[PDB]
Amino acid sequence: MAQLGKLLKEQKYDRQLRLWGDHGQEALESAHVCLINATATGTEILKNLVLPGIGSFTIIDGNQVSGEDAGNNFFLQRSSIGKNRAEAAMEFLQELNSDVSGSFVEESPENLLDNDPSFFCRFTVVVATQLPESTSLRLADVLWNSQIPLLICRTYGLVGYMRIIIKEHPVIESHPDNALEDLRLDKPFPELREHFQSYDDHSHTPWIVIIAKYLAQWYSETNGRIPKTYKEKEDFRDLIRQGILKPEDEENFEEAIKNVNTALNTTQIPSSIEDIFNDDRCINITKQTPSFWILARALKEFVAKEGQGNLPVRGTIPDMIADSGKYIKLQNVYREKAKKDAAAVGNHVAKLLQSIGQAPESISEKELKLLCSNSAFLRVVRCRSLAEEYGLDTINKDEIISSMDNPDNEIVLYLMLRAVDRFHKQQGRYPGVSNYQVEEDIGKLKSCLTGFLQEYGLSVMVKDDYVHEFCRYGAAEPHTIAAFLGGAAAQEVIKIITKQFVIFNNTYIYSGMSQTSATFQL
Amino acid sequence: MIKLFSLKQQKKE
């Protein structure tokens, strides 16, 4: 069944293999994810990781299954009531995918922290859910000092809270949506001028050539390279339209007319890339410098030398109605150039490995090809620590204060969470859990709010309606809100494992009430 | 929305 499982997976994961590829699937199947507290939020997140084929998982839960537990969890049942939740959840989650290996530990995270702190060292990523403030901060420290990626997720009433913690997460394959093409019309390369010069059928020429034609013409008069959209770009559009004559050519020239707004586009190093280049880790190498920065540096070198100020040509171009032969020859000019610059970048990568003796080819040819294709799309995310967020002098109070300018910004929801946790510390229970404790808990909740705010010198105005609403929640974990957070959280974990796409930086707050959300850098 | 909507919590006809 060895190969009947190889293709069995190919067909099973086809819809997703088309998103992150075979390499992404591989990273995923090699990972081991840990989940703390299998209630609705955790099994939802986990199911979204198990269906796509996460290598393995281990649930950590020391609680027993409650009635309301079995009432809001698709992976628990009436018969599970009274038994260990971690154990009960795995059995059902495991049924979702046999290519995944489930596991659990009937202990509490606090317990595993006291006895076996290194226990969490075995996971690719740790996802914690429904955790109290103290357990979180304590869990953050260990994991932060262990270089272990952490995602804290919490569902409270109609609020979804997600917090990711990774010291550094460098990504090459960020999959940019609607990126500007690297057409080089403003900074043509020899082969490109050559290809264009080769012109002077007419109704079936790549628009890129129709533009270059008039670009050389326009640039020969005013000598301006055209940033004025409507202005040097609308006259340019008109100029191009003129050359049709009796041509039932429009379709050709017209398509040239449309892209004029997206192709005169300059060539230029993206701001995000500058910062990667001018970053301490790109400038100061060592034997410890991870493959990413070596590749970052090589790219910086290229921009200095062979690149003549710019990044290696991408290699791809959009489709363009045009005779097959014309389209292909044009495309090949770009592919050739792309291959050419890539090699140059390879030459720099070697000269960096040697002056580090790191290795001969500790970077496959495929990685080099990937890097150059995505040179304009590299991203780097550095998350603060939970300690930094909690510290009295480190807390980004400006962000909070400024956001609170709007009394309904979803940052109030984060402030209320903090107050709920403090209430749980002071009272040993959550507010309003009982229809009877609501009215009375409002005041005690407002009290803990005021205290939390004064403790940080946060001069913000939190409307009473939110304290009332948070008490009304009774610490519920509504399934549909847990499901929302579960899809969101799940994909962020897949982003961590695969290092594909871009993870949200810091806190994501979701409001099921207004179906709105926001991201913050706390 | 000009007018607010509310679903009758009764069976249909």
Place this chain on the structure above:
Amino acid sequence: MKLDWEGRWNHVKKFLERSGPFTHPDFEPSTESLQFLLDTCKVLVIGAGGLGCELLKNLALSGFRQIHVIDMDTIDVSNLNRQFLFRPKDIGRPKAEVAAEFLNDRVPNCNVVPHFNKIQDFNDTFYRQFHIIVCGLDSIIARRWINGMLISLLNYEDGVLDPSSIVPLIDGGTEGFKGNARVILPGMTACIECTLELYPPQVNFPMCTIASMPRLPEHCIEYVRMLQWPKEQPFGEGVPLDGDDPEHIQWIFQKSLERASQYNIRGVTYRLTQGVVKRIIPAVASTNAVIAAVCATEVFKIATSAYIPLNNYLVFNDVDGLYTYTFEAERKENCPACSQLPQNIQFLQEVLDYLTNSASLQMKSPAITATNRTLYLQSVTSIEERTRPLSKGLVDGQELAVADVTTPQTVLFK
């Protein structure tokens, strides 16, 4: 034991038994709304694929019991990375049936009734039975069709909409790491037809390119699928191309590489061949979970009037970090589907083209009939022929009546 164990609905009750500051205006706390949910609120889920499975779980755990599912498909191995109500053993069985089966077993007293049907098989009578309808399908045609069906249920007395005749329509869609959700209150808010720009029909390569200017691997594959297979009949006269048939795709893949060689096009792979033939849309579990959650939460709100519903159109994107975006789609007054007044054309293949190539009316194959006599049709090869004479029997005010596969309704245009 009683049906509901202790604290079973604790996570739902709190939003029905407690007053609140953000509640819906017509909301009143009650220890009886949950009962309406468990005993009488009928919800119809259109689709057992992707959003469907997620939607059945969501409603079930939210206190709904009278749920129906419509789906005309069979379980496929490729459904298994996200359609968690199905297992490898179920491959080949109707999804609708298996979805109800799994759901009814996992949620103790749920009552999911399946329907191995397409939405077109039913009429008014069937749909009026429901309080709320949630659609998680993938074709624009279906979305528009069900949109037209609910609009048709509307009853105006003297131009005064009868609220009891309004059937909310919650609609959700997904695409890789993107998705959308929206609340449609037929006759009160923007319907699907009011925002056609939001539903850009899938890619359909131009003939000229496919037949004479291929540039991409996809064009080659497309050529083989759309022209060569119909011409040649690789597997016998009348044998239709079966996108799931391993032998058929291997055939298409080989002819594709053939055409690609002749035009020096790279990239024809078996995977890409499958993608094109089946017009596959990449999909994962997480994005479907997010969107079905928004949709279910809104179905709940509409049923219990717990909170005011999504204004109307939410978008989710998970690619660069993540975010949700919501805005209020406007009900177009000139709407072919939900307006109350007939269309006003001011002008035969002048209207059939206008009713097809327009943007306000992206009808697919309209059948035009004069006041009381079929003028043109297309559903009959003689109708498309005999009646075809498109070749330039009417007057001025005449009330034409179009009909497309896009709606159950007869759009009256003058």
